[PDB]
Write a protein that binds this ligand. Sequence first.
Ligand SMILES: OC[C@H]1O[C@@H](O[C@H]2[C@H](O)[C@@H](O)[C@H](O)O[C@@H]2CO)[C@H](O)[C@@H](O)[C@@H]1O
Lengths: 90, 694, 67, 68
Amino acid sequence: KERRAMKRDYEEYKVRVNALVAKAQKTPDEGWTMQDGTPWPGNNTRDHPGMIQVFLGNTGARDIEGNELPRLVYVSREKRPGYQHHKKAG
Amino acid sequence: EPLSIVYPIPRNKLTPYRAVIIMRLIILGLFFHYRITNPVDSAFGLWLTSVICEIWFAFSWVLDQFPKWKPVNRETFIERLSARYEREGEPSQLAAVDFFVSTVDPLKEPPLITANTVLSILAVDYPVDKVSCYVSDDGAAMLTFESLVETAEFARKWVPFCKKFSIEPRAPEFYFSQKIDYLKDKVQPSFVKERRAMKRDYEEYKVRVNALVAKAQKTPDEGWTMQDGTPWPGNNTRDHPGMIQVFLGNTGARDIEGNELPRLVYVSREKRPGYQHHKKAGAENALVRVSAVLTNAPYILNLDCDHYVNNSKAVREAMCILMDPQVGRDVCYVQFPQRFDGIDRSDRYANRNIVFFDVNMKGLDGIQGPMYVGTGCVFNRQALYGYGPPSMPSQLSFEKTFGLSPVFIESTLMENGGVPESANSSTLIKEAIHVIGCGFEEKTEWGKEIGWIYGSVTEDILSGFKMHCRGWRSIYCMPVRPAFKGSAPINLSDRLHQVLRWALGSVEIFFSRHCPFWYGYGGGRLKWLQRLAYINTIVYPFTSLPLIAYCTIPAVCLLTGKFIIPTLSNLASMLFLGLFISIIVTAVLELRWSGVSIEDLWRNEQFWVIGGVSAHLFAVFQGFLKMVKWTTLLIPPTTLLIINIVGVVAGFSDALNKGYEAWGPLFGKVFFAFWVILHLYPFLKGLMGRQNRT
Amino acid sequence: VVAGFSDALNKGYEAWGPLFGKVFFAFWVILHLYPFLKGLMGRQNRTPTIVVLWSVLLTSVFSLVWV
Amino acid sequence: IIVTAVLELRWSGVSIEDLWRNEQFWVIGGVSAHLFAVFQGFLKMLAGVKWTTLLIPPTTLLIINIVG
Ligand SMILES: OC[C@H]1O[C@@H](O[C@H]2[C@H](O)[C@@H](O)[C@H](O)O[C@@H]2CO)[C@H](O)[C@@H](O)[C@@H]1O
């Protein structure tokens, strides 16, 4: 009974990633804008200030039952012209 | 701006190809000097037979190589066509199309396949106010009529679902039974929910059709009766008044949402004893006459009951060439390649037949155009009537050339098409019923010079030849998607019969009045390089007779003679070496530009030889006398195998008379007989075998 | 290798042991790098025409050099 | 031996490859399985095996043949 619902939910979730990719295929002339109504901080691949964010942390979303889940961190470095950035070691 | 472009070979792979063939001709000519200045080989009889047989092969190659000169390629776009003709604001300015489907018997061919084909036709990507469908059945049957009613009911749900999600293919039977991941590029949010419901509905519909088919296995003693409470008009297969009906029309059933769907028409002919009815040639003519009275259209499309549409944009692609103001002035029809599915990886019997389509058709497209095959073609209405290409220099005549019906005579006068005075529906129905009489084509020219031509079994070849003789032109199309798919024979019994049927038709045409040898010369208008292409297609069967003679020399020589040509005098070695290398170099160059794999070329050659000694033989002798069982067709091939294997082994035994060196010809005859038992071995043994050949 | 054979077996007798060793070494060399270097071309095997091509090339070269 | 085999196939309906499979299978079974079975029954009569050892007889015959 739970397996059938889980399969249906996975398929529904798998459709939305394809939808997102299809939308992202084409870029606007001015640039990407966030949902809140502000421009995406990184508009140039070779120039973007560093960013850090935390999702699904201890103080935040909780499971349906009411328990907690491991925290997740997303980090993006800072790049400026005129320097060398080693691929993986850096 | 142009709607389509045509470009030739990039010229990098063209000049070497021409240079190879031109040099080959000189080599062949010199080789015959040696074979004519050596009059003795210890047996005059063998010498006389060998030289004559070889000369024929040279002529056959000449008639087959030249037509492949000057290949050409084409391309088309669809975005520009929509912008130009379908600009918003005003209504569409596109042309109308018509479809024809022919059926004969319900029991011999299952009705489920026919139902799937009908559904596919109604799901095309074209305005619903233009397309139309027609269905014709020769033998009246209640199952076909009842099956169509069920299909129409299910079409209400099937149509809107396909259009919204743009799914392909649009045939439920051939679409659901696919293992390709169906969640590949879909982006709609509610695709899964609707898909589950549709699958359940299709299964229920399938069960209903099965029950209906099984119900009619028995026949009531009194006879079949309709639901309303009246007898079925056609109770005798050889006698039934013609019937006409309309389903799913503009004024009738509507989609669930509230839109309209293409109209469907069901028509049956009239048959009476004491008259001869042509098969598949009078049926097409009858449909054309009926369609003109009901709904005139400028184009006609023909299809079988097995093939189905695989691409939803096929109609637009075909229309993008015929509607071009410049290149579309002189075009009779557009040919589409035919493809088959459900084929194993190892095509033993070469059912796909790619060499002819991917090589011969492209080469012949350069002169005038391709050849009519029978399915997948769009025919101009004016061309069928036999008027003539444009831009080129009484009632009694019209009555005697077309018929006695006045409505049909006045219909052809329309520049575009339609109903002239928008009369009541009842009168049109009565006229349509009256214009399908049994003895309507008594004093008319139908068949003789108008429409489909009666006579030979392979009437499609004959019909195309007459049209081309008046200066018309044809075009070839090769979309990325197949756009058309059908079925192919599985067992060898059907394949051998299929080859035998084609050969007989060619023989009949040769001995009839419509012979290219002395037909069409008056008035010209036919390119001299295509008349040669026509000659080869008509005289190909006769090439089988010398072929059997050549295959007999190796055994006879190896038994008693053991000598065919004199030993080389230091001059034939270079000539022999030049001959062998020449064939190799031409083959590789053809592969380089043709794109066909090397393996498939070998299969075509192997299949050709076997198919000649079995059926093509009968067509020339059974037909000479006429102007066979699976066991009986296999007789001539079996005889060659036994003779060429018992003789070759015997040669080795008698070779023990000499020493370790038996003078060289052993390898001379060993690879001469290997060739015979290298191309004919894998089929005769392969087609029967026992199992696993171990 | 083939040409070597066509030479040695023409005249030399009792001197075909070193020929056998050389042929064995050549076969050892050839076997390691024929399969991978060949199979990438074709679907499974182009033997049908390859065998006849090699045979005709061999016989033609032998006859031409013999002349 | 050849003509008789063909006629049997014609009416029995069996296939030739099945006949060959059975014939050669009978040979191997006789060497190993039945040899030990005949001997084991002789001991209890007068009185009143692992997989590894079962293959010993077949192994010996193969080695002596190839070396000889
Ligand atoms: O003869 C008419 C018949 O031709 C078929 O193509 C043949 C071709 O005519 C023949 O020269 C060649 O050897 O074989 C192909 C088929 O593999 C065609 O397919 C038929 O539709 C047509 O009726």
